[PDB]
């Protein structure tokens, strides 16, 4: 008999009170607007589009969602901007300028010492 966990997909309570719910590997005909069937379960409360954006709230198996435009949406995430390198058999590209960048990296080193 079908079953599974129930998890709500909220876009931050600070920006909205809407929510969508994914029923993991539950068919949308056996759950009991915007109903979308995916191979990862039944997605309710978000409309599925064919465009692609950067992952926002991972839903699983390639799908995501996020407040759009005042709404929640799902979509097949895109892997990144596409770009062709202008390769040829006698062409080269050399920089003529540069910048100095600074980036952070954070690492934990210790925990609190406990005794019972």
């Amino acid at each position: 008999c079908s079953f599974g966990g129930v998890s709500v997909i909220t876009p931050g309570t600070n920006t909205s009170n809407q929510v969508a719910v994914l029923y993991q590997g539950v068919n949308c005909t056996e759950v009991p607007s915007n109903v979308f069937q995916t191979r990862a379960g039944c997605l309710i409360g978000a409309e599925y589009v064919n465009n692609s954006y950067e992952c926002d709230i991972p839903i699983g198996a390639g799908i995501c969602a996020s407040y759009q435009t005042q709404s929640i949406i799902a979509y097949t995430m895109s892997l990144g901007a596409e770009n062709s390198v202008a390769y040829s058999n006698n062409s080269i590209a050399i920089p003529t300028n540069f910048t100095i960048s600074v980036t952070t990296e954070i690492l934990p080193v210790s925990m609190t010492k406990t005794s019972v």
Binding site: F3, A61, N83, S84, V85, A86, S88, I92
Partner: protein, 311 residues
């Protein structure tokens, strides 16, 4: 599902299980930690490229023939010939398997972007903009990095390209190995087969079925018999989750090594001994495998020495 594993359907059990506190909350929190890290492990190994690079239509790089590692346009999956071999070698009582966030098509797209970036711009795209340079000249810089003078390639370009093409061709013969990938599958399958089998144990009770107890016994004594079974099966879940945490730390350490090699063997040239294959590192090409990564290490090996007198 803690309640469906232990009790199982019965509802008289649910009120008894609530009397043990938050053990079922601990199991869900512990397993969620693992579930989130396993998707991050994959992103850190493969999602090291901003843009999705493509090779030019001609696909002829001064001779070198890379058709065995580039995607095959005549396939629904767009895998490479070698990736097709790599994937050809490897529900219950409250148990479920969740799907990965990234499909294997998406992973193939990260691998083809790393291949297209490297073959056309070498290691420059990992530090900034991709800078094109002819591939034959890329190989000559790589010999220079290991202390070989660059005319050795330019005067012998055809020999090196032909010898490379056969040397990479031999890789398929050695495949048509992946025991490290099958072991991961086996270890989880064995823990799930054992977890289910542990439900057919009496643990010293009159029976092993929480409904049969009631059918042939009064409540005062049935609460004791069901409490014994609950304790036994709750111990089963604690054993299961503890081992998944210990084993997830090992695959995480492996994903960290694979991500480090992806940066240092594929996006650049390393001087670290034996870190990028046997011999003097020239270059490496990634391939996708199920739940893993395969590195094709290209090395420089000297041959045919003569002895001389020196001073």
């Amino acid at each position: 599902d803690c309640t469906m594993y232990i009790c199982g359907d019965s509802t008289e059990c649910s009120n008894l299980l609530l009397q043990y506190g938050s053990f079922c909350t601990q199991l869900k929190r512990a397993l969620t930690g693992i579930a989130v890290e396993q998707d991050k492990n994959t992103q850190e190994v493969f999602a090291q490229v901003k843009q999705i690079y493509k090779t030019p239509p001609i696909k002829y790089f001064g001779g070198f023939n890379f058709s065995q590692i580039l995607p095959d346009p005549s396939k629904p999956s767009k895998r490479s010939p070698i990736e097709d071999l790599l994937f050809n070698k490897v529900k219950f009582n409250g148990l479920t398997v969740l799907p990965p966030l990234l499909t294997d098509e998406m992973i193939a797209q990260y691998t083809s972007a790393l291949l297209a970036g490297t073959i056309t711009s070498g290691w420059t795209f990992g530090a900034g903009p991709a800078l094109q340079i002819p591939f034959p000249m890329q190989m000559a810089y790589r010999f220079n990095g290991i202390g070989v003078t660059q005319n050795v390639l330019y005067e012998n370009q055809k020999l090196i390209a032909n010898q490379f093409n056969s040397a990479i061709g031999k890789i398929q013969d050695s495949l048509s190995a992946l025991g490290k990938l099958q072991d991961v599958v086996n270890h989880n399958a064995q823990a799930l087969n054992t977890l289910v089998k542990q439900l057919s144990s009496k643990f010293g009770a009159i029976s092993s079925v929480l409904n049969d107890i009631l059918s042939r016994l009064d409540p005062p004594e049935a609460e004791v018999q069901i409490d014994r079974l609950i304790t036994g099966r709750l111990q089963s879940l604690q054993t299961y989750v503890t081992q998944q945490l210990i084993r997830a730390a090992e695959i995480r350490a492996s994903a960290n090594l694979a991500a480090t090699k992806m940066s240092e063997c594929v996006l650049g040239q390393s001087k670290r001994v034996d870190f990028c294959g046997k011999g003097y590192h020239l270059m490496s090409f990634p391939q996708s495998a199920p739940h893993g990564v395969v590195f094709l290490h290209v090395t420089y090996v000297p041959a045919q020495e003569k002895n001389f007198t020196t001073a």
